[PDB]
């Protein structure tokens, strides 16, 4: 330290390797929007053809549920069994396991229970796999000529692009969003009674008249002695059209003419399913949904995956042509332009301070100089940790650029002015100053980490969060305290000029320095005005109290969110049909919703996504926006758009239909609320626990001072139609009862029978009823039996029909039958009483009928009894820390008791804007503590010096003492409170965040230092007189 | 872990050939302990209930959330779950010219969930209106309805 | 002791849901001494102090 | 018992586009066979955990 | 003709990788040596000496 002042090339080479370990940090360092913060989850998917919801909750959910025993780190299970056949399971895990091994474990258990399963579950798939959320990109595939339907665009997805989109640099998963081409047989019901088949027939003959055989190979080992030939022996070669299936024998009659399969039914290449239904803008089309690769870029993979389209562009067939729905990128590069302009624009303005006080260029040049490499190097210790550039990370960076800003700030000041004030040539004066500030230096190094290293032990989602920004801040924190410590002596002691004893240039300037009297006369004015106000006290601690009770009030007057909501060029408009509804009503409605944002929001809507999304009963609605540039009013943004399309579907529709817009990070915790789950425990039916769901409804309903909108996240029970068969009569006629089942089965939900290849790729083959005969009831007359003898029997012969209810989504939770409960807190009342208030009504539920949180309301459960003994910890590390620096265990008081001085100014501000008590508001406190606090210290140890190591007074100490912090503090909060503005005064993309880290910044720094240069050395000079008679006074001694 | 996955992999290689009865009883793999870490009871002071029903308890309420906790190897069950048990008479099988193959076949089709469908099933026809679930062949619940067999 | 606690509280949630009369009794557990037994060498540096 | 280029557009093809997103790959390199075998190896990154 | 590449691999792959990196390598190293030797010697010159 003294070291480098004459070292200083020596300071130079640390600075430049710290720079060039930056640099090269810097130009390999990852991007995304956000940092890996959801705790682990693996689904398990399967689907049941045919099947309903309890069909599949109870005979793969469960068996499932079953053998997921003994796997590492669960947090918890949960199952959907959807009536489209499907059910997903969601395995949760403690945040941060490895989620790999995790997967692996899940996957294999998974792998052991699969012969307890059914058959057409087995060959249908179970899927493991990692559960978020996120997908980096969704890119749409459209027809110009309009040429194809989905179907066709969606087979030609499946077939050309998945390979070189799942090619291209930094393309984690590809995923295929609908149906590819399988073979689709639709089945004539009066055809097929015609000729005395069944299914049966159907599928059995298919099965035979298409596989491969076990061949075999001529000359083949051991052969004979002299041997000659050996090749392969080509058998029965699966099927390549519709025109060979036509063909396929399903009986002969006697008079020998044969019976096709072309014969009874409409033959082709038909869609997989047909549940899910697409347009982008009224033209069909299908999708792809891009995951970025695991440490891997957005920005790039987005440019890489879009000039690989661009490439294959000519090559799409007729009119096909590429679209873009989706790209959280654009977005991420445009946030990150702004908070490289921003620390930039800091560095700026800082030198206009700099100038503009201490008029000289080399002076401003040094601290011009720390702040990059401080940068950089901090860029390195976080790309050494392997952090990424997120929202996080660099807001992370804003956030500290006070405490880098102010560092340099404090020693290249008090150089100058010791050279000012003693007229020492440049060196021995920045020996002398370091000689001053060095032991504060390493203390409030102390002191800093002491605050900021506590919130980075939080647990779950928030304390990842958390995490970011502490690491963040402990390091640029750190390099700036050495690089205070190392290079900035050395630069003072080096490229800084001499300054006359009892300069002051005071005048002298008929320019410019008219301004240096204007602030010195104000210095003194200052002095006058502080002992003036040590005179008498009492006033002054009154109206401590007075600020520190109304900081609390405010505080509790404060709103609780987690991110703010940020314009992000997309929102969606999700659709829900009132039950039991079909594909066409639900896609009625998307086609208005569409249209209307094209109308009335011409000069918004660049496109808009309709996802008839499966369930039918349901639909959605993707929606994107044109460039942030063309929609610049009020009116013309999100808040807006989305409040004018919820007022337009909100009366005039016999469907209900929101639109709005996302939370940040995909899987947020809403704030204010919580995820219930209610659940059974005897072994009781869904009847009662629904039933003792309408009564949680009633009990909930009736809370409206605790609990506000109260919620089952499902779909209720709707009519399904009960065929029973009477077995009797079956057994009766002689038909046997697999067959009518079966039958049944391949004529209304489908059989997936067999494969076939097409054009060299592997795709389905399925037999289902043409549509026009498997839709009302009565089709089932439709529909015949064939007996064990040979006879026709219709269905309505052996059976009954009715209606009666049933639920289509059967929900379990850790293994049990359950029912989930979404909720949030009254408008004024916070989610743990409501979360209390929750379990006293749901305590008024029946035996069977326990509770149990999951989810947000897991990671709220456990995490935040942790606030308070994390600022313990830190109240006391910081108070021993000071306790060390200074040689007293009371005199920390005096700089720890202006904490509240900072904190009053930011809640006034930040209600003032009516924003929220958030990460970025709440980072943003510390910081504006810490800040007050070094201050504080830089005041408290400069007056102490002068009492100890010059003998002089308390009161005359403090009074020279503030006197040489004043052109400081201000320097730097004039410089800090000048960067910030834009962040306060700033829309464009994601300002969201600008405004609501600028503003209790920025409100913060002005009552932090406002209040400071005159409440610190009443704070001191009270404090200091809890001590010893003799000494007192003070003012002898012996150096 | 680790060690544990590679072993159930070269089990995989066994799985095909091992024969059905051995397939669906249960197969598993588990990094577990040597000896017991401890052992839980269950019981009924008044004796309301017999044994079989206090480990019916065990299984259906219990057992799988404890061989979930994270740490725990493996569960021994001191006893049995409820499992629908036919206890077959010999010369009642001579007396009606019946065996337990006859048995098992029909138990098998007169106790099933079947591929039901659904109602304006998707592709549904154009201006079509319902739409909704076909509820099929039902497993039976009961003994009584397992005496209709 | 860790698996033991976390089947204490699986436990001690499962118990409200049970039929008539049913009670969990303890045969064996290693636990109880590993907790009680560190614990006497623990009151023992402390007296020793 | 099958051919070479029915192994290989049904099976090979189909494991290379599932072997997106695979951590410190360097190479991968695939044989598709009529003895009935078909073989995908890949090699990682220099010191990759194996 | 048009579309028909060439590669390394294996055995020629991590040759192709020395080759690849025997400049950087030299010039990092080389480097490296210029700030040791203007740090510990207080010169500018001993490194271009
Ligand atoms: C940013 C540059 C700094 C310069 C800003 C200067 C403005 C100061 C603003 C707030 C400080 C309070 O200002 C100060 O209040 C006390 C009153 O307690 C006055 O002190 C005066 O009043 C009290 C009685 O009322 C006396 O005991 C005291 O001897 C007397 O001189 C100060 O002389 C006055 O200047």
Redesign the interface.
Known sequence: PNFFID?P??AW??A??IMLAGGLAILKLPVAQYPTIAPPAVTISAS????????VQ??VTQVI??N???????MY?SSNSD?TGTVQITLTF?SGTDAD?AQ??VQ?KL??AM??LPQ?VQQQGVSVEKSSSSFLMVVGVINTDGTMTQEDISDYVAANM??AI??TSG????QLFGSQYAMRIWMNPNELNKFQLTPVDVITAIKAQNA?????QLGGTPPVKGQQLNA?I??QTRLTSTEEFGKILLKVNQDGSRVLLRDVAKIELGGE???IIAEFNGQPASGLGI?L???ANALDTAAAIRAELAKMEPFFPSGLKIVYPYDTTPFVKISIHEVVKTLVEAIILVFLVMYLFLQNFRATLIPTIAVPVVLLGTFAVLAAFGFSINTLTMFGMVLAIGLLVDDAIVVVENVERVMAEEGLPPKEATRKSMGQIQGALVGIAMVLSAVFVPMAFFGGSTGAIYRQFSITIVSAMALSVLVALILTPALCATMLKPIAKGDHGEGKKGFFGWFNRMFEKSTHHYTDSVGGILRSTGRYLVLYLIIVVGMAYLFVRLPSSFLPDEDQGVFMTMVQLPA??????TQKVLNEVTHYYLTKEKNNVESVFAVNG?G??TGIAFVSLKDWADRPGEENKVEAITMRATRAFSQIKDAMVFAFNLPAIVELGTATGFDFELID???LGHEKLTQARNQLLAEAAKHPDMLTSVRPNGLED??????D?D?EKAQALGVS??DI??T????????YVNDF?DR???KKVYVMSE??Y????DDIGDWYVRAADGQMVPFSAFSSSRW?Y?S?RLERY??LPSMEILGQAAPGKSTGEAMELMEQLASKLP??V?Y?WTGMSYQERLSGNQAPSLYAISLIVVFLCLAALYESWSIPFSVMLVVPLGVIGALLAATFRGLTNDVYFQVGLLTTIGLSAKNAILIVEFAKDLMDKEGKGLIEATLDAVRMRLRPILMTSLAFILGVMPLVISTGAGSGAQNAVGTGVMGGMVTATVLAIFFVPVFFVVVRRRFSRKNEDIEHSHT
């Open positions: 070292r090339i020596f080479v640390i430049i390797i049941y053809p045919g099947a309903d919801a309890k069909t109870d005979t549920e079953q997921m025993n003994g796997i590492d780190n669960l299970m009536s403690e091994i692996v474990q294999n792998q052991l012969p307890l057409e998945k390979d799942s090619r393309v984690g998963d590809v491969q055989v076990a061949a075999g392969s080509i058998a399913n047909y549940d995951k690769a695991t440490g039991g509804a079909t594909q066409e009503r499966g039918q009963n425990q005897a072994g709707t009519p399904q139609f009960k065929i068969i077995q009862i697999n089942n079966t049944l089965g391949a004529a209304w939900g489908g059989s290849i060299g790729r592997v549509a026009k498997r839709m009302l009831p009666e049933g289509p850790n293994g035996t069977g326990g149990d």
